[PDB]
């Protein structure tokens, strides 16, 4: 799974990409591909962190290191363009943090006056503001934000832009319904309330499976009669029904829609709710 | 059908005379014991978990909603209602919305039975002692 | 014989889980993809192919009857 396809929220520090996933996933491996590599600053160390906390927005976890579990540390050679992170045990995660923790930084003569990206005038490295047009030479090339604390950050803390490389993440994972770990009675109460709400939802959908029950019971009766009702050419033609399919017994088509469509959708929803309830019960127990 | 046929207090009293109240109390106790012996199994969730319990408790509440039956069976129902409520309070993992409604109904019935003459009350207190005799939380 | 064979396979009342179109087979709405495969094959063979052939044959028979009537 491409990490980009399952991210719903992302925040950055100068060294970290912090991501909320669309849902909890069981992850066995992480692959990092590195493109457009610049030799001036290359990643030496990647740390992978995770947690399974339900959050509304990932910003709630951005500067909260004590809320993250370290899955793996990996070392890179200079100019390495692919990293395979095999986890010794699969992790269950609704959030990930990828940290570029150390670098093979190649030192250069920053003393030389920088060139203005707008007007090409010479700009002193301190303060890094063009005396001709007022442009800041340390602005992010992508989003124009300026970092006050770090003039040359590895990542833009506003948009995650990196001038030193491009990073693609491929997660060998699978969607897995799960809940946040229970800590103290505060979380115990939260889990119990969540269980009660999910049980109410499960009761509602049960009724849907059972709501289609009499309908299927009835359509099956009609189909068993095997009556040759002559083809009914209804004026409404919104549905793309081919002559052969239109000539199929209406009750047969009605049965196929009711069971394979409606009953299957309701049963899938109920099974998802039942699995999530089982996970919550297991965590509470 | 059964609740419709006994909607009149006439037939409720008739059935109570025949001994329906101990029967429903024993059925409620057996169902609650089955749930207690069932929470030792997996967290297998059942949608219709407690429908029988809720319906039996509703029947008992319907019978109790008649004054004469309440008068004659408070001392005999206090013990089984106390035991059922205490055993339902132990449920944590298998606690279903229907189980919660049943526990609330049992609490209301117990409160309705606590009310009585000091004698009936002291008799209910003696029952409470036996219920505790039958764990630092439940007592 | 084709319809006969389809009827024989249908009367087997056998459940063959919808075979996933690994190849680029014609798209079939899931609603209709869950019918029996033999039911759909029968509907195409008879209502489509047999009906088209019978309509062509009936048109030819009517034209032949008109020609015979004119000749007579
Ligand atoms: Zn400038
Ligand atoms: Zn930026």
Phi-psi group of B90: left, alpha or beta (phi > 0 → left; psi -120 to 50 → alpha; rest → beta): alpha
B-chain residue closest to A274, CA distance: B45
- Rounded CA-CA distance A60/A95 in Å is 11
Nearest CA among A202, A192, A199, A193 for reference residue A283: A192
Nearest CA among A160, A138, A161 for reference residue A149: A138
Whether A49 contacts A191, CB under 8 Å? no
DSSP A52: -
DSSP A57: S
Q: How many CA atoms lie within 13 A of C37 on its CB side?
A: 9
User: Tokens for C64?
Assistant: 């032949």
Strand A43-51 and strand A82-103: pairing?
A: antiparallel
What residues have a C-beta under 5 A from ligand 2, the ion? A 140, 142-143, 145, 156, 158-159, 161
- Rounded CA-CA distance B64/B106 in Å is 11
- Rounded CA-CA distance A44/A46 in Å is 7
In order, the DSSP letters of A58-90 are GGGGTT-GGG-EEEEEEE--TT--EEEEEEEEE
User: Tokens for B97?
Assistant: 């919305």
- Rounded CA-CA distance A17/A61 in Å is 11
For residue A207, the SS3 value is helix
- Rounded CA-CA distance A152/A176 in Å is 39
Whether B64 contacts B112, CB under 8 Å? yes
3-state secondary structure C6-64: HHHHHCCCCCCCCCCCCCCCCCCCHHHHCCCHHHHHHHHHHHHHHHHHHHHHHHHHHHH
Whether A247 contacts A208, CB under 8 Å? no
From ligand 1's centre to the CA of A143, what distance in Å?
18
- Rounded CA-CA distance A26/A20 in Å is 14
- Rounded CA-CA distance A197/A212 in Å is 23
In order, the DSSP letters of A193-206 are HHHHHHHHHHHHHH
- Rounded CA-CA distance A34/A168 in Å is 7
- The residue written with tokens 């109920």 in the block is A270
A206 touches chain B (CB under 8 A): yes
Contacts of B100 in chain A (CB under 8 A): 196
A271 touches chain B (CB under 8 A): no
From ligand 2's centre to the CA of A158, what distance in Å?
5
Whether A93 contacts A24, CB under 8 Å? yes
Give the method of determination.
Answer: cryo-EM
Strand A122-123 and strand A114-115: pairing?
A: antiparallel
Stated as kind and residue range, the H or E segment containing A94 is strand A82-103
Nearest CA among B23, B30, B134 for reference residue B76: B23
User: Tokens for B29?
Assistant: 């106790």
Strand A122-123 and strand A16-35: pairing?
A: unpaired
For residue A92, the SS3 value is strand
Closest CA of chain B from A236, distance in Å: 40
The total number of residues written for chain A in this structure:
285
- Resolution reached, in Å? 3.2
- Rounded CA-CA distance A233/C72 in Å is 41
- Rounded CA-CA distance A65/B53 in Å is 48
Q: Measured on CA atoms in the order B24, B27, B29, B32, is the torsion positive or negative?
A: negative
Nearest CA among A128, A122, A123 for reference residue A152: A128
In order, the DSSP letters of B73-129 are HHHHHHHHHHHHHHHHHT-SSS--HHHHHHHHHHHHHHHHHH-S-HHHHHHHHHHHH
A137 touches chain B (CB under 8 A): no
- Rounded CA-CA distance A18/A12 in Å is 6
Say whether the B–C interface has 3 or more Cβ pairs within 8 Å. Answer: no
Task: List C-alpha distances in Å: C11 to C14, C40, C46.
Answer: 8, 14, 17
CB atoms inside a 10 Å sphere around CB A194: 17
Phi-psi group of A167: left, alpha or beta (phi > 0 → left; psi -120 to 50 → alpha; rest → beta): beta
Whether A129 contacts A139, CB under 8 Å? no
E-strand stretches of chain A = 7-12, 16-35, 43-51, 69-75, 82-103, 114-115, 122-123, 166-175
- The residue written with tokens 């491929």 in the block is A170
């Amino acid at each position: 799974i491409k990490l980009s396809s399952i991210k719903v929220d992302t925040r950055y520090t100068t060294t970290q990409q912090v991501v909320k996933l669309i849902g909890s996933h069981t992850i066995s491996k992480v692959t990092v591909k590195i493109g457009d590599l610049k030799r001036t600053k290359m990643v030496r160390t990647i740390n992978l962190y995770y947690n399974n906390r339900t959050v509304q927005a990932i910003v709630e976890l951005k500067n909260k290191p004590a809320r993250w579990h370290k899955a793996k540390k990996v070392q890179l050679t200079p100019g390495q363009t692919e990293v395979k992170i095999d986890l010794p045990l699969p992790i269950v995660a609704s959030n990930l943090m990828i940290e570029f923790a150390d670098f093979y930084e190649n030192y250069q003569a920053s003393t030389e006056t920088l060139q203005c990206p707008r007007c090409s005038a010479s700009v002193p490295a301190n303060p890094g503001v063009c005396g001709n047009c007022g442009e800041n030479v340390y602005q992010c090339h992508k989003c124009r934000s300026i970092n006050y604390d770090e003039k040359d950050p590895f990542l833009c803390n506003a948009c995650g832009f990196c001038k030193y490389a491009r990073f693609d993440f491929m997660l060998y994972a699978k969607p897995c319904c799960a809940v946040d770990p229970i800590e103290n009675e505060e979380d115990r109460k939260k889990a119990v309330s969540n269980i009660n709400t999910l049980l109410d939802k499960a009761d509602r959908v049960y009724h849907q499976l059972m709501g289609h029950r009499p309908q299927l019971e009835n359509l099956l009766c009609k189909v068993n009669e095997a009556a040759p009702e002559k083809p009914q050419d209804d004026s409404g033609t919104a549905g793309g029904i081919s002559s052969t399919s239109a000539s199929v017994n209406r009750y047969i088509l009605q049965l196929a829609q009711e069971y394979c469509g409606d009953c299957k959708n309701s049963f899938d929803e109920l099974s998802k709710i039942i699995q999530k309830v089982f996970a919550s019960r297991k965590e509470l127990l | 059908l059964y609740q419709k046929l006994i909607t009149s207090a006439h037939w409720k009293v008739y059935l109570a005379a025949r001994g329906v109240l101990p029967y429903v109390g024993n059925l409620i106790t057996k169902e609650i014991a089955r749930l207690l012996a069932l929470e030792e199994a997996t967290l297998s969730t059942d949608l219709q978990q407690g429908y029988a319990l809720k319906s039996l408790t509703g029947l008992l509440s319907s019978f109790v909603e008649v004054e004469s039956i309440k008068r004659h069976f408070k001392s005999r129902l206090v013990g089984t209602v106390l035991n059922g409520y205490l055993c339902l309070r132990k449920l944590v993992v298998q606690r279903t919305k229907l189980i919660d409604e049943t526990q609330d109904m049992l609490l209301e019935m117990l409160e309705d039975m606590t009310t009585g003459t000091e004698s009936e009350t002291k008799a209910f207190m003696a029952v409470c002692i036996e219920t505790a005799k039958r764990d630092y939380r439940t007592p």
